[PDB]
Design a protein around this ligand. Structure first.
Ligand SMILES: CCN(CC)CCCCCN1c2ccccc2Oc2ccc(Cl)cc21
Length: 273
């Protein structure tokens, strides 16, 4: 019934996450994204309420797709003999944040503030749902250009949130914290905060701060672009070398740089129309 219920469109991209296509749900013409992954390329498995064997991505997406949030929701899934197929929300028009920043350069702080806030709200949501994303970055954030609303994608390197140590990582290296680089050990939240510092820098500078492992471990941040003392301070805080010197989500959201955020719609009127 998968081919009956969805009309397939153009390929949107492919990579470690599989292949993703543009789609339309024939029911009510809902725009969707159709993502295929081959079974032998799945290392991470978990189980359902009814308890069948599924990719962990499905377990994690189910856990975060209840109610509204800043997460692209899993609408349905299908097993095939050699692959799983996931039906996801698709905003229209949409652009990922990597492309947006490539095209438009470093973001004005008012815009970075709005965007970064919405990311923080989405990541808190995942955390509340018992999900750790583990690959927060520009390419995993979609922008609904009409509503000014950001949406997290790609739970393929994620895990159940826990309070004990993680000793595996298959997210993006240049967003990975120094403790991972040095010990192959991190805890969830504070590694997430590090990734968020990288993202914020990326937003306001138009590129990431560190390329090589030794820069990550050195942790010295240099600004190529004019950025306010308050934004610089938040970034250097998120990027504390010691995980315990990093702020909590609450402390990030109470930081003075974070005050007076624009709502999504205003953000789109000002910056996106
Ligand atoms: C690197 C950005 N872009 C170049 C053209 C490649 C597209 C990667 C994003 C595809 N994606 C996507 C990638 C990886 C996991 C889930 C995903 O869910 C989506 C849902 C809706 C849309 Cl519109 C897109 C996705």
């Amino acid at each position: 019934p998968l081919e009956s219920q969805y009309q397939v469109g153009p390929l949107l991209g492919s990579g470690g996450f599989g292949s993703v296509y543009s789609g339309i749900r024939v029911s009510d013409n809902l725009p969707v994204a159709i993502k295929h992954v081959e079974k032998d390329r799945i290392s991470d498995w978990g189980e359902l309420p009814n308890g069948t064997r599924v990719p962990m991505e499905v377990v994690l997406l189910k856990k975060v797709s209840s109610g509204f949030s800043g997460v692209i929701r899993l609408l349905d899934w299908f097993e095939r003999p050699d692959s799983f197929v996931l039906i996801l929300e698709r905003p229209e028009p949409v652009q990922d944040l990597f492309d947006f920043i490539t095209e438009r350069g470093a973001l004005q702080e008012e815009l970075a503030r709005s965007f970064f806030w919405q990311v923080l709200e989405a990541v808190r949501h995942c955390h509340n749902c018992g999900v750790l994303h583990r690959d927060i970055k520009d390419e995993n954030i979609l922008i609904d250009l009409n509503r000014g609303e950001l949406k997290l994608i790609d739970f393929g390197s994620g895990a159940l949130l826990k309070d004990t140590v993680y000793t595996d990582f298959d997210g993006t290296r240049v967003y990975s914290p120094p403790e991972w680089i040095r010990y192959h050990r991190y805890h969830g939240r504070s590694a997430a905060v590090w990734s968020l510092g990288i993202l914020l820098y990326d937003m306001v500078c138009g590129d990431i701060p560190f390329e090589h492992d030794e820069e990550i471990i050195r942790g010295q941040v240099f600004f190529r672009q004019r950025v306010s003392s308050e934004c610089q301070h938040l970034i250097r805080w998120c990027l504390a070398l010691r995980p315990s010197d990093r702020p909590t989500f609450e402390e990030i959201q109470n930081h003075p740089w974070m005050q007076d955020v624009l709502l999504p719609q205003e953000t789109a009127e000002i910056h996106l129309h």
